[PDB]
Design a protein around this motif. Structure first.
Motif, PDB file in Angstrom:
ATOM      1  N   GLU A   1       5.526   7.835   9.070  1.00  0.00           N
ATOM      2  CA  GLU A   1       5.499   9.244   8.654  1.00  0.00           C
ATOM      3  C   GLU A   1       6.319  10.109   9.616  1.00  0.00           C
ATOM      4  OE1 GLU A   1       3.762  11.861   6.496  1.00  0.00           O
ATOM      5  OE2 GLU A   1       4.006  10.266   4.996  1.00  0.00           O
TER       6      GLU A   1
ATOM      7  N   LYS B   1       3.255  11.282  -3.771  1.00  0.00           N
ATOM      8  CA  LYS B   1       3.869  10.504  -4.858  1.00  0.00           C
ATOM      9  C   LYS B   1       2.828  10.176  -5.939  1.00  0.00           C
ATOM     10  CE  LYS B   1       6.772   7.865  -7.198  1.00  0.00           C
ATOM     11  NZ  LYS B   1       7.953   8.405  -7.921  1.00  0.00           N
TER      12      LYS B   1
ATOM     13  N   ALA C   1      10.168   9.085   9.040  1.00  0.00           N
ATOM     14  CA  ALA C   1      10.639   9.668   7.773  1.00  0.00           C
ATOM     15  C   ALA C   1      10.929  11.182   7.867  1.00  0.00           C
ATOM     16  CB  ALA C   1       9.618   9.414   6.679  1.00  0.00           C
ATOM     17  N   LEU C   2      10.352  11.860   8.875  1.00  0.00           N
ATOM     18  CA  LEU C   2      10.516  13.292   9.113  1.00  0.00           C
ATOM     19  C   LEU C   2      11.640  13.585  10.124  1.00  0.00           C
ATOM     20  CD1 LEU C   2       8.277  15.924   8.493  1.00  0.00           C
ATOM     21  CD2 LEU C   2       8.414  15.849  10.961  1.00  0.00           C
TER      22      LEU C   2
ATOM     23  N   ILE D   1      10.884  13.551  -1.992  1.00  0.00           N
ATOM     24  CA  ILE D   1       9.429  13.329  -1.923  1.00  0.00           C
ATOM     25  C   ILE D   1       8.901  13.743  -0.534  1.00  0.00           C
ATOM     26  CG2 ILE D   1       7.533  11.728  -2.553  1.00  0.00           C
ATOM     27  CD1 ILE D   1      10.331   9.847  -3.249  1.00  0.00           C
ATOM     28  N   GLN D   2       9.692  13.490   0.533  1.00  0.00           N
ATOM     29  CA  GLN D   2       9.373  13.835   1.923  1.00  0.00           C
ATOM     30  C   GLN D   2       9.282  15.357   2.106  1.00  0.00           C
ATOM     31  OE1 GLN D   2      11.819  14.604   5.341  1.00  0.00           O
ATOM     32  NE2 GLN D   2       9.761  15.476   5.355  1.00  0.00           N
TER      33      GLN D   2
ATOM     34  N   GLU E   1      11.556   6.001   1.929  1.00  0.00           N
ATOM     35  CA  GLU E   1      12.051   7.202   2.610  1.00  0.00           C
ATOM     36  C   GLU E   1      12.532   6.882   4.026  1.00  0.00           C
ATOM     37  OE1 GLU E   1      12.516  10.655   2.047  1.00  0.00           O
ATOM     38  OE2 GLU E   1      12.103  10.449  -0.106  1.00  0.00           O
TER      39      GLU E   1
ATOM     40  N   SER F   1       6.259  16.661   0.332  1.00  0.00           N
ATOM     41  CA  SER F   1       5.147  16.262   1.196  1.00  0.00           C
ATOM     42  C   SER F   1       5.030  17.203   2.398  1.00  0.00           C
ATOM     43  CB  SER F   1       5.323  14.820   1.666  1.00  0.00           C
ATOM     44  OG  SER F   1       4.310  14.427   2.577  1.00  0.00           O
ATOM     45  N   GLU F   2       6.182  17.608   2.983  1.00  0.00           N
ATOM     46  CA  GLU F   2       6.259  18.511   4.134  1.00  0.00           C
ATOM     47  C   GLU F   2       5.766  19.918   3.765  1.00  0.00           C
ATOM     48  OE1 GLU F   2       9.989  18.177   6.515  1.00  0.00           O
ATOM     49  OE2 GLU F   2       9.377  20.057   7.491  1.00  0.00           O
TER      50      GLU F   2
ATOM     51  N   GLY G   1       0.083  12.372   3.221  1.00  0.00           N
ATOM     52  CA  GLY G   1       1.478  12.028   3.508  1.00  0.00           C
ATOM     53  C   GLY G   1       2.358  11.925   2.257  1.00  0.00           C
ATOM     54  N   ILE G   2       3.505  11.221   2.388  1.00  0.00           N
ATOM     55  CA  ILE G   2       4.511  11.012   1.335  1.00  0.00           C
ATOM     56  C   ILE G   2       3.928  10.149   0.198  1.00  0.00           C
ATOM     57  CG2 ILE G   2       6.831   9.999   0.838  1.00  0.00           C
ATOM     58  CD1 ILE G   2       7.262  10.758   4.043  1.00  0.00           C
ATOM     59  N   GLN G   3       3.170   9.085   0.538  1.00  0.00           N
ATOM     60  CA  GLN G   3       2.548   8.197  -0.450  1.00  0.00           C
ATOM     61  C   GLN G   3       1.454   8.933  -1.234  1.00  0.00           C
ATOM     62  OE1 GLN G   3       3.957   5.093  -0.977  1.00  0.00           O
ATOM     63  NE2 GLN G   3       2.674   5.039  -2.805  1.00  0.00           N
ATOM     64  N   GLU G   4       0.697   9.811  -0.545  1.00  0.00           N
ATOM     65  CA  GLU G   4      -0.378  10.619  -1.120  1.00  0.00           C
ATOM     66  C   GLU G   4       0.177  11.644  -2.119  1.00  0.00           C
ATOM     67  OE1 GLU G   4      -0.442   9.579   2.167  1.00  0.00           O
ATOM     68  OE2 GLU G   4      -2.327   8.449   2.030  1.00  0.00           O
TER      69      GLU G   4
ATOM     70  N   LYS H   1       1.420   3.624   9.613  1.00  0.00           N
ATOM     71  CA  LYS H   1       1.526   4.716   8.639  1.00  0.00           C
ATOM     72  C   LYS H   1       1.938   6.026   9.331  1.00  0.00           C
ATOM     73  CE  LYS H   1      -1.104   7.276   5.114  1.00  0.00           C
ATOM     74  NZ  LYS H   1      -0.883   8.614   5.727  1.00  0.00           N
TER      75      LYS H   1
ATOM     76  N   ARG I   1       0.820  -1.215   0.000  1.00  0.00           N
ATOM     77  CA  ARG I   1       0.000   0.000   0.000  1.00  0.00           C
ATOM     78  C   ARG I   1       0.857   1.270   0.000  1.00  0.00           C
ATOM     79  NH1 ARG I   1      -1.729  -3.893   3.392  1.00  0.00           N
ATOM     80  NH2 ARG I   1      -0.480  -2.940   5.060  1.00  0.00           N
ATOM     81  N   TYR I   2       1.927   1.314   0.820  1.00  0.00           N
ATOM     82  CA  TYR I   2       2.809   2.483   0.912  1.00  0.00           C
ATOM     83  C   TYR I   2       4.287   2.080   0.650  1.00  0.00           C
ATOM     84  CZ  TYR I   2      -1.414   3.482   3.705  1.00  0.00           C
ATOM     85  OH  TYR I   2      -2.709   3.572   4.159  1.00  0.00           O
ATOM     86  N   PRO I   3       4.700   1.911  -0.642  1.00  0.00           N
ATOM     87  CA  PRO I   3       6.089   1.520  -0.926  1.00  0.00           C
ATOM     88  C   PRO I   3       7.076   2.696  -0.878  1.00  0.00           C
ATOM     89  CG  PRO I   3       4.837   1.531  -2.957  1.00  0.00           C
ATOM     90  CD  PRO I   3       3.863   1.833  -1.861  1.00  0.00           C
ATOM     91  N   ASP I   4       6.643   3.900  -1.304  1.00  0.00           N
ATOM     92  CA  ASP I   4       7.481   5.103  -1.342  1.00  0.00           C
ATOM     93  C   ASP I   4       7.700   5.686   0.059  1.00  0.00           C
ATOM     94  OD1 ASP I   4       7.820   5.759  -4.434  1.00  0.00           O
ATOM     95  OD2 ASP I   4       5.732   5.156  -4.106  1.00  0.00           O
ATOM     96  N   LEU I   5       6.731   5.485   0.979  1.00  0.00           N
ATOM     97  CA  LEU I   5       6.834   5.914   2.379  1.00  0.00           C
ATOM     98  C   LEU I   5       7.860   5.017   3.083  1.00  0.00           C
ATOM     99  CD1 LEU I   5       5.882   7.380   5.070  1.00  0.00           C
ATOM    100  CD2 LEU I   5       3.959   5.826   5.100  1.00  0.00           C
TER     101      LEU I   5
END
Lengths: 297, 305, 295
Positions: free
Chosen positions: A171, B131, A174-175, B154-155, A139, B158-159, B126-129, A167, A132-136
């Protein structure tokens, strides 16, 4: 011929499988951790109410639950130095016997989560998360390793925080992972983003009953910090312990509210003596919640 | 059952049409495709009580009378059942007294719900949203996307997008946001200052949403209060005395309690710091800088704190 | 729609000749500036007057116009602080409307022309001049080429002769790293075009600056990227002289030094946009220089 120790065994006295699967299901809803299949076996040495949890064929915790009678917060028993009153099913006409056993069992599982949930358990969870979230996930892997994600997740569960909303945890990682290296301070940032969830589980009818710390005790712990680990005098420790014992024996349900910088160090000073109590910082407190102070130590 | 349901709207003990109207309007007004909202009923809740749940956790509670209208009058003898959202009192009048601005009941619920979603945008967007949004944007502007990816990740994109939405700025005009990032990301390597550059390029949009008949009702800041916040910056964090905080809070409360919708016009260097000092106390007041106010717009100063 | 409508023109609630007008404006803008404008959306409003026309860039109000399509201008109206008068059936109704609309589009060229618009332009350019394009990409990025083109259009300079712009970039980009200074070099190579548009009968009407005001702006240049900050006394002395020339039938261009022309424009752009700022390196030979006033 065997190969490894069996992860979970629930020892009972001389329908039962339905209860085991209900605990496994609820623990996944409440905390988001897929528990291993629990083995059921009867022992002649145990009492009619005695239930013993075995993690890796070694005794982990003992329980006293009467399945034919309900209970309130008269037969009395204690868990995490907190007395529980048991009454018959006729006097109720309050929490169920099966629901109270789950609450006692779940706490014991989170205290020894390092033996149940590990790096391999984290990877299998992240593999499903990749769909569902590969790019998240990409990172996060760029700054923190699978061991670091496993450590963050285990530290959250140790202080009763659900990893079902991975998720939001990912998130937060990743920040803050490109900024911070220390896992202990990285967990504190994840707790700040989970402030709305933390407040929800500790609030009753909208209000939170907190027990704050005095300026002296707050500054005494601040100096006890040395370079990573906490070390304080017996006088400060006794003043803190006696005040918590006075509230626990009175049967007052509360949460300790301390400063953001000392929150992780305060938890270490009480961890062994007081286990049922939860330590929350000011940064983890969300608005629209009534903060009710009971005592200032 | 491995995932927590993103949105739940608990109502009292056509409805799906309303839910889809909110989902459509939120994309028109902000450019964010909301997740599918779940409808549930409760006997514990009142008739007008509507509670929003983000990831099965209580986020915000609303009071809307779907058989009435709204107006920001009542002393001339009208059955008014008033309530409040974000410390601003809203008067509810029956549909019979409409024939004498006027706001619809479902439109008021949208305005109240949309504000609550932007205040918790970190759990929705978020980051996935981003992308998925950037991949659709790639079919239209691939080389513009390449120049942005050359300096910011991408982060960070997203930020920036999350920081803009948190202050009611739409991300529907992504081309202008990307054009602003492609120009400033090789120069600036700080997200908070990079957002300010995107805000300055979106000055025409910001002024359009805060103005009424080509006039912006602003509340300026005195030399002393402006200078006091300037020295509050330590590292980046803001810390000021309780005396300066009380002066700013009392004047804001005086203009909020008495029916007066306004915007706060401050200096460019302290705009992000002033926001952090009031956002936890008051969430309906917008913080705008002198660089963000576009020409051919009448500036109306109401008060100077 | 996922993306906002780039251009919308709201008209009075009153034929299909409007589509011919839109395409004539789109075609003329490419002849005058060399920019392929996005397709303009035609709409009617009952709220607007019979003469009112409103331009919308990215579904946001940008500029308002007062044009009488059944009349000829040389009833009074004003655009960019400059007054004009209309009379019954010299400047045409559709030709004067284009002049006002095109100016508003150049003032917001950053929202119409970007990196992707520059890339599509350079791809067509590659089919004719590939080696010239290669020498530019060796030192200049697509963003910087897009920025250089945007800075020229914002000062009413056509990007139709992309060859001469790219030839100038390939010569100065390995020497200069500043984009603002790089645009100044492109203007020097476009000196013949600049003079051809600002002159009438081979004469340029200039409004030069005094030694004091020239040194005052030169002193106000700070390194805070560089920004211009001067006192209100110098600002009022410059504004009053420009206003006095405007409340009188005066068609002029401000002529200053090469070092301050980019900073002089910044101080004027915020108040007046109709007046153009040109340097001494941009004035071409065989052109009569007529000094009207010295500020």
């Amino acid at each position: 011929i065997s190969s490894e120790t069996v992860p979970l065994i629930l020892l009972f006295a001389e329908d039962m499988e339905g209860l085991i699967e209900r605990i496994r299901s609820q623990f996944f809803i409440d905390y988001g951790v897929r528990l291993p299949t629990i083995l059921y076996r009867t022992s002649n040495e145990l009492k009619v109410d005695d239930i013993v949890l075995l993690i890796n064929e070694v005794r982990a915790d003992s329980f006293n639950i009467y399945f034919d009678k309900v209970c309130i917060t008269v037969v009395s028993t204690s868990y995490n130095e907190r007395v529980i009153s048991w009454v018959d099913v006729s006097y109720t006409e309050i929490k169920s016997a099966q629901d109270e056993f789950y609450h006692q069992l779940s706490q014991a599982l989170l205290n020894n989560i390092n033996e149940i949930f590990g790096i391999q358990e984290t990877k299998n969870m992240l593999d499903q998360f990749e769909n569902r979230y590969p790019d998240l996930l990409k990172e996060v892997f760029r700054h923190v390793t699978i061991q670091r994600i496993s450590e963050v997740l285990q530290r959250l569960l140790g202080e009763n925080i659900s990893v079902r909303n991975l998720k939001l945890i990912m998130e937060s990682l990743a920040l803050w992972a490109p900024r911070e290296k220390d896992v202990i301070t990285l967990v504190e940032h994840v707790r700040a983003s989970l402030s709305r969830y933390i407040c929800s589980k500790i609030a009753v009818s909208g209000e939170i009953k907190v027990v704050m710390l005095s300026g002296y005790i707050e500054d005494a712990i601040r100096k006890g910090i040395r370079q990573m680990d906490i070390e304080v005098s017996d006088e400060v420790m006794e003043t803190l312990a006696h005040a918590l014992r006075e509230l626990r024996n009175a049967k007052k349900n509360f949460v300790l509210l301390v400063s953001v910088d000392i929150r992780r160090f305060v938890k270490r000073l009480i961890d062994n003596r007081f286990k049922s109590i939860l330590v929350i910082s000011y940064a983890e407190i969300d608005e629209a919640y009534t903060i009710n102070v009971l005592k200032t130590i």
